[PDB]
Amino acid sequence: MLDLKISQSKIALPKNTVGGTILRSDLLANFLTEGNFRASVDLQRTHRIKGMIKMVATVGIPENTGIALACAMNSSIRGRASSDIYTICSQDCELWNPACTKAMTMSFNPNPCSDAWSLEFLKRTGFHCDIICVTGWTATPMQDVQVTIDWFISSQECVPRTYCVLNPQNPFVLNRWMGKLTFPQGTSRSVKRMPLSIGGGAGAKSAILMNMPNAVLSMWRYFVGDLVFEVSKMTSPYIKCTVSFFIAFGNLADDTINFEAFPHKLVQFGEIQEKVVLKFSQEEFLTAWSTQVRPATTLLADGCPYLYAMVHDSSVSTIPGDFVIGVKLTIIENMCAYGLNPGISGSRLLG
Amino acid sequence: MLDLKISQSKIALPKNTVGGTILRSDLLANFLTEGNFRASVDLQRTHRIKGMIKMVATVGIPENTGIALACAMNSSIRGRASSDIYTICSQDCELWNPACTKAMTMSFNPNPCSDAWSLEFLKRTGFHCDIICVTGWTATPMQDVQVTIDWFISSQECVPRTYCVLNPQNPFVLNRWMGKLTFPQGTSRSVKRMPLSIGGGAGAKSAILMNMPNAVLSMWRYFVGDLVFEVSKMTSPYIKCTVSFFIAFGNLADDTINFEAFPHKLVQFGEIQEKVVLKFSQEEFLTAWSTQVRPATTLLADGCPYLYAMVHDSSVSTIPGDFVIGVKLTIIENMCAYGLNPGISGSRLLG
Amino acid sequence: MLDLKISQSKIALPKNTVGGTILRSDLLANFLTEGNFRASVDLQRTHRIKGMIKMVATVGIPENTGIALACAMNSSIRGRASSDIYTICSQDCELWNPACTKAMTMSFNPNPCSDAWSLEFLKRTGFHCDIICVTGWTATPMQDVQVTIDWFISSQECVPRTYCVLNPQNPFVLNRWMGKLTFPQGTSRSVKRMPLSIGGGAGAKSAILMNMPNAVLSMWRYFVGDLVFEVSKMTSPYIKCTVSFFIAFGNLADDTINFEAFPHKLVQFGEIQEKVVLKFSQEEFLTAWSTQVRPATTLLADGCPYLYAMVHDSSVSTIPGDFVIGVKLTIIENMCAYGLNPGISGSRLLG
Amino acid sequence: SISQQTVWNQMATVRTPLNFDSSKQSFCQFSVDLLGGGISVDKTGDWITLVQNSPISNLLRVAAWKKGCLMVKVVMSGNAAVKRSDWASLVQVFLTNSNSTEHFDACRWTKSEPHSWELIFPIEVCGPNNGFEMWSSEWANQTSWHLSFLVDNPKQSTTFDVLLGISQNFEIAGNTLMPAFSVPQ
Amino acid sequence: SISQQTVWNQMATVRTPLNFDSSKQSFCQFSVDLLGGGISVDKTGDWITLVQNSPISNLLRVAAWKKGCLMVKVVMSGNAAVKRSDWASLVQVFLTNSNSTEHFDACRWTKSEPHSWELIFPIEVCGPNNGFEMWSSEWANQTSWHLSFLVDNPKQSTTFDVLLGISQNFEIAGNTLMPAFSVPQ
């Protein structure tokens, strides 16, 4: 490690940070160029590098507070690009809560087309890095905080990740943000409904947000597959809540008593636990469904399935704050798609 | 155990205790004489005892507070002896934080010259015991606290520990307090520099504090060895901080960017974890260095190495208080010393 | 190599440089700190280095000119130390003529007492480096010249070189400069006489120059051994001359016809050849001779042998300049010394 | 074995009272507790005494159990103003394990060289523990080693320096809690 | 092993200031840096000092790393005109690794024989490198060996000669660049 260390960045995290807040957004080449460490001139005087870039971020905070940070890598950027968690998280992005995880690691290949990169390549290509706060402090710290990131050239070789549009691989890596779900403290069910007609991007105001893997799925007309979701605790470990997940249609009433007669998954997090991976297999879906539904479509007229999330018991704590979790559809296994999509204009807004 | 129990002491710990505060300082013979337990008259009517003395101290406090206690044993005492953690911890002394450790044990041989002791021997010899608070409460308890100590005659035989001044053993048991380091909450580096020219004792005001093992090392002119440090968390587990340790010279500036290009160790404590043992081998030292440097020597003119400690990321919490750790150089392995030391007058103050 | 490269120095060589001229005299640590190459931060962030320091100097000049440069390494320096070729060449020093050698290499151990060094050690110890011009240009270049030195950490381990004063090793490394001999163009014999009573240092004006290995030999009263001399061509390869070397006594006349009836060695250099190693075995010496003779001693009263050098044929060229060679007694094999030397005041001046 | 030639450690410097009054009595007395580290003096005037905080001086005061040899060197530097012909002074040195007079002397010397003299001798610590002895412990009615001086004519034999040399076999065990040692300045 | 009996090397000759003024102060002081090769004196008058360029004096000044034993001999040749009965002088000798007063003495002597005396003792060089020590290097905060003299009554104890004897085990490494050594005449 030490010898393969190339740089070190210190990101500032103000005690009053809010969420949606960009901690730092820059050219990856600039994060990789801070400080003179062992492998620094090598990084600069070497024409091809095969090891992946590895980063180690550290910062610890007490259990009676929480905050969700996301560190995202993207091949390029044009203009005043969106910094929304949805847009930035499709390539290589890790989301973490320092209250649960005091040191986070991530290795990635900056050149998905091949197996090597260059620092020049990173500069002239515009490889980008955004570090944003996805959810603010549950309880504010006494003082301002700081996250230190150590950068290394890994011994792990780079491997390509390309997408053949009309010939998806298995599994299909989607990395689509499904939304940020909040369950306010109390005995409320707070039923959440995330549509599975994920084509067309994420809704914005008279606009749409878009990322590459979501754009390739939008090319197809109908699809099915085993869906894998990654659920993250973005709030303090002091706010407890048992969430129930299941597949159902938009037209069921919030007060449907036997919602849990459907196949479901109950999620409770341990103090220090922050992630849970849910997997809904194809046995939950009778047939493929539309990749896109026109945005104006009502819950009553939607013929496509939904990922439901609701409070099983209650959201409780001794400190103020809603229980908040983030849902990300990581991969689709044994996917199956039909036909080409002409396209529908616009899409619904995520959570 | 029960049958080999000889006494029980109850030490008072006021909710407002501060640190440097002596909870109880007495003749060991007096702690061993409280209460009538199974082995009590045996302790008094037996001329030689080969089992070590074992003590078990208990007291638990919640994780949102902390306090560091030290229980130290010394062969004798003359006059109004110093009670500073440095002076009292060289023979047999255990330092603990009830927030992490709710029951502490310690076994020792009161007669380092041989393998047996007597209660009479303890009385007429002046064997001493000090229980002091090294760091006060991070957050004060609701009420006053009390620590209960159960004393036993162990089944473990006593073993001698003697020092041949001009012929050190391997390992050399030093037990020298290097200081109490405080890192205030914030994004500050708070660089700490502990000199490795540990000869001559600890500085005091127009005085020097001294303990036996440190006095024998001061007899030699130059030395090197694998240094083993024991780092203890003396504050509440709610104040989080990643500390970085490395060897370097006094003349580097606090803002040296690539401090961590040197071989270093990053330390983060888990909620309930309180101790960490660092070991710096001889590969970190080119040659032996002075056992003593004259006190007035500047950071710029010091040609001997230093143990550096600094904040890697930041010191953060939701409750007030600095992150505080205590450093103790326990043993020196494969030590190597050169020449006899005429002596230099006085020494620098520890942390 | 490339990866183990630590620095690069560029030494200026003015077209009018003269000889005795110091091109650069500095702390070795400063030459090793110029430029940021692959192993640069390693050199600075590593406490012990076992590889030797290797340097590669390059500069080429045409055959119709010449100049003798010397690059010398010494453990320390006190005050306004002498920079004379004699004083500086006893530890690790290479002498070269760019007209013959266009790239020169040298590896050395900066810490003769052991097998490792540090950059800190180099700085605080005062390890010194002098680059001097021993002989000026035979013919001046068109423009100013520059010598580039690349510095590397070698893969070759460091090995100690210590001297036990009253117990010389075999061979004994002396590295004593015997003088700079000049043979002006013409048919003259130009007889040269270098005394072998090399103890007491080199003469200066009402002073003596001294280096360590010469100082240890001066400790003994009488000595003999197989003497190894290294003869270097310090002038342009265009000035040709056949030099004849032999052992004889000071009292022979310059015109002794059968000087060459004695065992001798004839030296002629090829265009590109610059060094020749002469070796005079003990069969040339009947007994040991004085280590020191009092300076005022005449050629007629000197009972110690001499290394003679004279022109065998003639010194000839088509360009102006004397034929100049430098003689250095490198090692003494199978040496044998007798008694301790009280000392004689002062010594004769070298060539 | 760590060792170096000719490196002793200073332990004490006792300067005879400047205001000694020959008229009341002719001599004066002081005693150095070698293992305990103390100096005792007369009420004969104002003594100037000092225990150097040298490595050995520090070690001895803080070492609970001791055992082995120590080398002792006493150097008397006197009044250089007295002509040699007028020297009329002598100092008696006594080695005892205790200050009580009920104890006999282990050794005894009398030095009278003009202006200066030197006295070197070894002492050895043997105790009841395991050959280990604790300074004046009430335990086995343990003891120490005191070097006492009776200085006849304090105005000539004015100064005394005591140096200790540690032996290859000196061995200690345990720590004695002591108050801070004062550093002059 | 090269060796010969009774062959030492002269290192220094220090002559007390001829214009010393008894009235201002009674003693005077000088110090010889054994390994560094320097002599330091008082502002008490005009000292006549000299470091002989003997083989050992030359070797020590130029040897970067030293290690091993050396023999030291000090000869005091005084004022023969003073009648023995009038001798009233003494000189205190101190061995210290540094000139700073913050350093205690490795050894101490006091000589007062009339007209002349001699003092012989060994010193040993131990350093951090590999038992090797560099003269006063800032490196491991290395040091040297200084022999200091406090001469009480410089008019009687007038002259001091220092001779060094090399040991069978003295070993050195590396070269220290020095400026030319002055040869008287």
Short mmCIF file of N, CA and C in Angstrom, two decimals, chain E residues 113-176:
data_model
loop_
_atom_site.label_atom_id
_atom_site.label_comp_id
_atom_site.label_asym_id
_atom_site.label_seq_id
_atom_site.Cartn_x
_atom_site.Cartn_y
_atom_site.Cartn_z
N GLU E 113 50.81 18.24 44.23
CA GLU E 113 52.21 17.96 44.53
C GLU E 113 53.06 19.17 44.15
N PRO E 114 54.07 19.50 44.97
CA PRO E 114 54.91 20.64 44.65
C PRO E 114 55.77 20.46 43.41
N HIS E 115 55.89 21.52 42.63
CA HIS E 115 56.72 21.56 41.43
C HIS E 115 56.29 20.74 40.22
N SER E 116 55.85 19.51 40.43
CA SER E 116 55.42 18.67 39.32
C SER E 116 54.64 17.45 39.72
N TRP E 117 53.77 17.03 38.81
CA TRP E 117 52.98 15.84 39.01
C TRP E 117 52.65 15.27 37.66
N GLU E 118 52.04 14.10 37.68
CA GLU E 118 51.73 13.37 36.47
C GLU E 118 50.41 12.67 36.71
N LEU E 119 49.59 12.56 35.68
CA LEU E 119 48.28 11.95 35.80
C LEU E 119 48.04 11.09 34.56
N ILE E 120 47.82 9.80 34.74
CA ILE E 120 47.59 8.91 33.60
C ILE E 120 46.27 8.19 33.75
N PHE E 121 45.46 8.17 32.70
CA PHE E 121 44.18 7.50 32.77
C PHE E 121 43.69 7.18 31.37
N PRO E 122 42.81 6.18 31.25
CA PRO E 122 42.29 5.83 29.93
C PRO E 122 40.93 6.43 29.66
N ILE E 123 40.61 6.62 28.39
CA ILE E 123 39.30 7.12 28.01
C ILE E 123 38.88 6.13 26.95
N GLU E 124 37.59 6.02 26.71
CA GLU E 124 37.12 5.10 25.72
C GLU E 124 36.01 5.76 24.94
N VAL E 125 36.06 5.63 23.63
CA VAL E 125 35.06 6.22 22.76
C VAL E 125 33.99 5.20 22.38
N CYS E 126 32.74 5.49 22.75
CA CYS E 126 31.59 4.63 22.43
C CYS E 126 30.57 5.53 21.78
N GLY E 127 30.13 5.16 20.59
CA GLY E 127 29.15 5.95 19.87
C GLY E 127 27.94 5.17 19.43
N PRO E 128 26.96 5.87 18.86
CA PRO E 128 25.74 5.21 18.42
C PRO E 128 25.79 4.50 17.10
N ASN E 129 26.71 4.88 16.20
CA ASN E 129 26.75 4.27 14.88
C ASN E 129 26.94 2.78 14.92
N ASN E 130 28.09 2.32 15.35
CA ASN E 130 28.17 0.88 15.41
C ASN E 130 29.17 0.76 16.50
N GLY E 131 28.92 1.57 17.52
CA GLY E 131 29.84 1.68 18.63
C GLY E 131 30.74 2.84 18.26
N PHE E 132 30.63 3.35 17.02
CA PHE E 132 31.43 4.48 16.53
C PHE E 132 30.78 5.82 16.86
N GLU E 133 31.59 6.81 17.22
CA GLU E 133 31.07 8.13 17.56
C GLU E 133 31.75 9.23 16.76
N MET E 134 30.96 10.16 16.23
CA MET E 134 31.47 11.29 15.46
C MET E 134 31.54 12.50 16.36
N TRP E 135 32.68 13.17 16.35
CA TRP E 135 32.88 14.33 17.18
C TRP E 135 31.77 15.37 17.16
N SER E 136 31.12 15.54 18.30
CA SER E 136 30.05 16.50 18.50
C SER E 136 29.01 16.55 17.41
N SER E 137 28.73 15.43 16.76
CA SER E 137 27.76 15.46 15.69
C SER E 137 26.37 15.75 16.18
N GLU E 138 25.64 16.53 15.41
CA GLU E 138 24.28 16.83 15.77
C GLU E 138 23.46 15.57 15.60
N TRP E 139 23.97 14.61 14.82
CA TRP E 139 23.29 13.37 14.54
C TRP E 139 22.66 12.71 15.75
N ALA E 140 23.26 11.76 16.43
CA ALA E 140 22.44 11.25 17.54
C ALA E 140 22.67 12.08 18.77
N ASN E 141 22.96 13.36 18.55
CA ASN E 141 23.31 14.28 19.62
C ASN E 141 24.53 13.71 20.29
N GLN E 142 25.52 13.45 19.44
CA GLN E 142 26.80 12.90 19.83
C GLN E 142 27.64 13.91 20.56
N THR E 143 28.76 13.44 21.08
CA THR E 143 29.55 14.25 21.96
C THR E 143 31.09 14.11 21.77
N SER E 144 31.88 14.42 22.79
CA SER E 144 33.33 14.29 22.68
C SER E 144 33.86 14.00 24.08
N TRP E 145 35.14 14.26 24.32
CA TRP E 145 35.72 14.11 25.66
C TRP E 145 36.61 15.33 25.85
N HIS E 146 36.30 16.11 26.88
CA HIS E 146 37.02 17.33 27.23
C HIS E 146 37.70 17.16 28.56
N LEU E 147 38.94 17.61 28.66
CA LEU E 147 39.69 17.55 29.91
C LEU E 147 39.85 19.00 30.33
N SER E 148 39.21 19.37 31.44
CA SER E 148 39.24 20.74 31.94
C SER E 148 40.07 20.92 33.20
N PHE E 149 40.75 22.05 33.29
CA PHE E 149 41.61 22.35 34.42
C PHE E 149 41.26 23.67 35.06
N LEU E 150 41.21 23.70 36.38
CA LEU E 150 40.98 24.93 37.13
C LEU E 150 42.29 25.05 37.90
N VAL E 151 43.14 25.96 37.46
CA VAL E 151 44.44 26.13 38.09
C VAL E 151 44.44 27.20 39.16
N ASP E 152 44.55 26.78 40.41
CA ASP E 152 44.58 27.71 41.52
C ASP E 152 46.04 28.12 41.73
N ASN E 153 46.34 29.39 41.45
CA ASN E 153 47.68 29.96 41.57
C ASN E 153 48.56 29.54 40.39
N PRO E 154 48.24 30.08 39.19
CA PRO E 154 48.88 29.88 37.89
C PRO E 154 50.36 30.20 37.86
N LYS E 155 50.86 30.85 38.89
CA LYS E 155 52.27 31.22 38.91
C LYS E 155 53.18 30.13 39.45
N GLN E 156 52.59 29.14 40.11
CA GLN E 156 53.35 28.02 40.63
C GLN E 156 53.13 26.81 39.70
N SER E 157 51.87 26.45 39.46
CA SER E 157 51.52 25.36 38.56
C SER E 157 51.43 26.03 37.20
N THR E 158 52.58 26.24 36.58
CA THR E 158 52.63 26.95 35.32
C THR E 158 52.47 26.24 33.99
N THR E 159 52.96 25.01 33.87
CA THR E 159 52.90 24.32 32.59
C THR E 159 52.22 22.97 32.56
N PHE E 160 51.52 22.70 31.46
CA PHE E 160 50.80 21.44 31.26
C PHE E 160 51.04 20.81 29.90
N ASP E 161 51.45 19.55 29.92
CA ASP E 161 51.68 18.79 28.69
C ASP E 161 50.69 17.63 28.65
N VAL E 162 50.05 17.43 27.51
CA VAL E 162 49.10 16.35 27.34
C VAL E 162 49.61 15.38 26.26
N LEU E 163 49.75 14.11 26.63
CA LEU E 163 50.19 13.07 25.70
C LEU E 163 49.08 12.02 25.57
N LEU E 164 48.93 11.47 24.38
CA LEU E 164 47.93 10.45 24.14
C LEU E 164 48.61 9.19 23.66
N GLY E 165 48.06 8.06 24.06
CA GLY E 165 48.62 6.79 23.64
C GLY E 165 47.51 6.03 22.98
N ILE E 166 47.75 5.50 21.79
CA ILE E 166 46.71 4.75 21.11
C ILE E 166 46.67 3.30 21.58
N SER E 167 45.46 2.77 21.66
CA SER E 167 45.24 1.42 22.10
C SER E 167 45.20 0.43 20.94
N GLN E 168 45.43 -0.84 21.27
CA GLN E 168 45.44 -1.93 20.31
C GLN E 168 44.08 -2.09 19.61
N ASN E 169 43.02 -1.62 20.26
CA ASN E 169 41.67 -1.72 19.70
C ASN E 169 41.07 -0.45 19.10
N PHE E 170 41.82 0.66 19.08
CA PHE E 170 41.29 1.89 18.52
C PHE E 170 41.02 1.66 17.04
N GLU E 171 39.83 2.06 16.61
CA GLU E 171 39.37 1.86 15.26
C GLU E 171 38.60 3.08 14.77
N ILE E 172 38.83 3.46 13.52
CA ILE E 172 38.19 4.64 12.94
C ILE E 172 37.59 4.35 11.56
N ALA E 173 36.79 5.26 11.03
CA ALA E 173 36.20 5.06 9.72
C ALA E 173 35.83 6.41 9.16
N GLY E 174 36.02 6.59 7.86
CA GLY E 174 35.68 7.86 7.22
C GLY E 174 36.68 8.97 7.45
N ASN E 175 36.62 9.99 6.61
CA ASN E 175 37.53 11.13 6.69
C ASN E 175 36.82 12.47 6.87
N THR E 176 37.31 13.32 7.78
CA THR E 176 36.74 14.65 8.00
C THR E 176 37.64 15.66 7.28
#
